[PDB]
């Protein structure tokens, strides 16, 4: 069917949050007359109550549209102090056929730091919009590369293409952890988003990075291929985002092998991180093994492919939980779906599962209800939409993705070693709160 009940994502123009995730970058939205651009800068608010003030929010300007868009750009330029403006277009400019390139080019020839992305809402969701925005920035702001003028390529610098900002609820802490891990093994990291990023200076340095790391099942592959064609940069695709010591060590060793990093440094960093992580896991083993009242054996993960696969891998391989049902809701392109399914088939050496692709919450809930989770209630890793279903199943729910309307998220992370420990805390504080 076509109906989507309880949307699991937003339109492409919702990728304005990706632009506002870059420090000192202000998106300029053009959705038509521009009634409810607020529908987004407030949608991120009803994710883990984070708000876009770092680069947006009510700060975001919003709208023949060529004349009116030109007026908007002129007004925003003279009011707002931004390192870069990103102009995003919605339905009406696309359907009417407004020539946004003609409106925005004159400013660029004037030297203004402005880019435009044609991100018609009905074309796709905000993941496709994110890729469009990143490609627009690369094409219109980073521009062409000349090693003599711009600087020699650095083999040990990496551009990280990863979680989608403001849609992956814990993207700030998660990107902090990813950057920390990558710098541990001796890389210079262009994280490109969030508090740890340097801003547009980091984006201008994209051409002179050794390689692009696509740390996600499919998001960023388009950008990495584009950068390969443009600058000739090699790409490392690491579809599983690491959570915990096992997967994180595998990921770090894989990146070190790819980039030719010093193995002694990599091993020392892994040893220290593992020491800390396994001290905490040793402390946790008492609870995990002794807890009288039993803990969930099966789980279901509903969310975008990145966090879905990361959580499935961690829950199967670190905790030995039984995968009950995994549904990916970000609507990945049909070309990449078999590779994702393959990742799920080999989720462990002796565990094989599968992943479905549904975007309608009614179908997802019916699938969960039709699933058999054993004599114990499962643990759902989903969104606010699954709270009622979780109560119906008499099980726990952990909100791990959009919409996480019952989490206040400042710097929480669920990736790497520290994020893995935080995730365990969250999961098993939720489970024991049955009698709270």
């Amino acid at each position: 069917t076509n109906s989507i009940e309880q949307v699991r994502y937003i339109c492409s123009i919702g990728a304005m949050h990706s632009a506002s995730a870059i420090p000192r970058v202000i998106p300029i939205t053009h959705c038509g007359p521009g009634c409810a651009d607020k529908q987004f800068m407030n949608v991120a608010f009803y994710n883990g109550f984070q708000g876009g003030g770092y680069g947006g929010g009510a700060v975001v300007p919003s709208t023949g549209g060529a004349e009116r868009l030109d007026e908007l750009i002129g007004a925003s330029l003279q009011v707002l102090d931004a390192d870069l403006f990103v102009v995003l277009t919605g339905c009406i400019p696309d359907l009417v056929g407004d020539d946004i390139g003609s409106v925005v080019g004159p400013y660029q020839k004037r030297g203004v730091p402005i880019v435009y992305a044609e991100t018609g809402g009905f074309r796709g969701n905000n993941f496709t919009g994110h890729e469009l925005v990143t490609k627009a920035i690369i094409d219109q702001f980073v521009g062409d590369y000349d090693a003599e003028r711009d600087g020699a390529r650095e083999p040990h610098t990496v551009n990280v293409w990863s979680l989608l900002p403001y849609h992956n609820t814990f993207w700030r802490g998660d990107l902090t952890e990813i950057k920390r891990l990558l710098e541990g093994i001796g890389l210079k990291v262009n994280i490109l988003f969030g508090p740890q990023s340097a801003g547009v200076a980091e984006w201008k340095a994209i051409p002179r990075a050794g390689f692009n790391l696509v740390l996600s099942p499919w998001l960023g592959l388009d950008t990495a291929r584009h950068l390969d064609r443009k600058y000739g940069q090699p790409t490392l695709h690491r579809p599983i985002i690491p959570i915990g010591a096992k997967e994180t060590g595998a990921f770090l060793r894989e990146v070190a092998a790819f980039a030719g990093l010093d193995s002694a440094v990599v091993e020392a960093f892994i040893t220290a991180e593992e020491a800390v992580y396994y001290r905490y896991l040793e402390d946790f083993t008492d609870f995990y093994a002794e807890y009288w009242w039993g803990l969930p054996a099966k789980f279901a993960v509903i969310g975008d492919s990145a966090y879905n696969l990361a959580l499935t891998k961690f829950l199967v391989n670190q905790l030995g939980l039984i995968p009950g049902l995994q549904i990916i809701t970000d609507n990945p392109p049909e070309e990449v779906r078999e590779d994702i399914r393959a990742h799920y088939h080999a989720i462990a050496d002796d565990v094989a599962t599968d992943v479905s692709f549904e975007e309608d919450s009614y179908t997802i809930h019916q699938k969960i209800r039709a699933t058999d989770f054993g004599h114990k209630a499962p643990i759902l890793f989903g969104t606010t939409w699954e709270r009622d279903l979780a109560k119906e199943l008499k099980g726990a729910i952990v909100e791990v993705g959009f919409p996480a309307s019952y989490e206040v998220v400042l710097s929480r992370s669920y990736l790497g070693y520290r994020g893995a420990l935080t995730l365990l805390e969250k999961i098993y504080t939720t489970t024991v709160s049955a009698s709270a």
Binding site: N2, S3, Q6, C11, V43, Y46, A58, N125, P403, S405
Partner: protein, 379 residues
């Protein structure tokens, strides 16, 4: 703007968003508001079920009528609602699909109203046209319709002392409640610009009188409002007893409350029809008000006035004022200052947000606002 949340906040009904998936982003905002309203009102808490037709490229050149009918059938089969509303954003309005025909056809087929909204208020108009009963056999003499957006149960206790019952509408009201409004003995609107059309239509097309009196803000305002309710519903004895009792109970506390608020300079920028009541309540408490109303315009006004606190009813304003070190009254419940207890509630809220200045002043010192200096050197 409020049409979609109003239509989706009716329990036992299903709202269909005939538009691309993007225009359904509000489902999260509406769901949060709906759940919080249910929790506040004491009703069981659950997610609301809004269905989007999920229009794509193809529907932009052909039409979404087939997808619209499919979505309406899906809503009926999944939830079996008592009513189905239909919304229409810009992308679907431009292609000019004919929702009326499908709405009428499926309404006939299912036997429940299928209400296309024309986004005066589209949701209220549709409810009156297709849900509100006509020539009801019953006439609940002790039932009064109270129009509110989200609010809280303040009119419940207040009118209970008058022996009247409250029919909260439209939000969080079951389809049964919306059909009952033809039976009520009167209709009271909390705010003019937000509760005047629907009550006026109710009185015109149905025998339900509309209460025209000062809003329940301040002592005199609440006195007049309660006396009008009592006269309309013939409860003068109980109304006078309640008024005297509340005056006796509240007037002492207001004296003590007044001293704590000495020298406090407020600021109001809500709707002029409700900002008036808020300013009346503030003047009762002795707070000074010296302002009355786009991020840049609000920033300029706040810089000009520099109030201790602000009162607003729209989003985006509060976070900007926070970055200037000014707390805002959390006006998520417009019923905070209604009635005699409302005076004390607003005083206590003001004293609370005055304490919270610590946070905003700390934020104000460590944040760079996105406005360039050259413009910051000009109005």
């Amino acid at each position: 703007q409020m049409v979609e949340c109003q239509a989706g906040n009716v329990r036992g009904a299903v709202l269909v968003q005939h538009s691309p998936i993007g225009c359904g982003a509000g489902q999260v905002i509406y769901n949060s508001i709906f759940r919080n309203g249910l929790a506040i009102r004491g009703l069981p808490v659950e997610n609301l079920h809004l269905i989007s037709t999920n229009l794509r490229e193809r529907d932009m050149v052909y039409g979404g009528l087939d997808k619209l009918e499919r979505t309406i059938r899906d809503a009926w089969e999944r939830h079996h609602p008592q009513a189905i509303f239909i919304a229409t954003s810009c992308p679907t309005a431009i292609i000019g699909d004919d929702i009326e025909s499908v709405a009428s056809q499926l309404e006939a087929e299912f036997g429940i109203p299928v209400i296309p909204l024309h986004c005066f208020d589209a949701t209220q108009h549709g409810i009156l046209r297709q849900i509100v009963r006509k020539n009801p056999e019953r006439k609940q003499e002790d039932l009064v319709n109270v129009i509110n957006l989200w609010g809280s149960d303040v009119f419940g206790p207040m009118l209970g002392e008058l022996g009247l019952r409250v029919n909260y509408v439209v939000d969080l009201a079951t389809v049964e409640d919306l059909a009952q409004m033809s039976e009520a003995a009167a209709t009271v609107g909390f705010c003019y610009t937000l509760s005047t059309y629907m009550a006026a239509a109710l009185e015109q097309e149905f025998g339900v009188p509309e209460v025209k009196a000062p809003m329940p803000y301040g002592f005199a305002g609440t006195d007049a409002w309660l006396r009008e309710i009592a006269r309309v519903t013939h409860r003068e004895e109980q109304a006078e007893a309640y008024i005297a009792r509340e005056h006796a109970r509240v007037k002492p506390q207001l004296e003590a409350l007044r001293e704590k608020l000495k020298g406090i300079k407020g600021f109001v920028s809500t709707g002029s029809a409700y900002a008036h009541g808020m300013i009346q309540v503030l003047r009762e408490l002795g707070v000074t008000v010296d302002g009355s109303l786009q991020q840049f315009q609000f920033y300029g006004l706040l810089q000009r006035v520099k109030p201790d606190f602000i009162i607003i009813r729209h989003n985006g304003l509060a976070p900007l004022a926070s970055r200037l070190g000014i707390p805002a009254i959390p006006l998520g419940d417009e019923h905070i200052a209604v009635g005699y207890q409302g005076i004390l509630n607003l005083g206590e809220s003001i004293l609370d947000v005055l304490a919270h200045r610590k946070f905003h002043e700390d934020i104000a010192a460590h944040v760079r606002l996105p406005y360039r200096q050259d413009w910051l050197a000009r109005d």
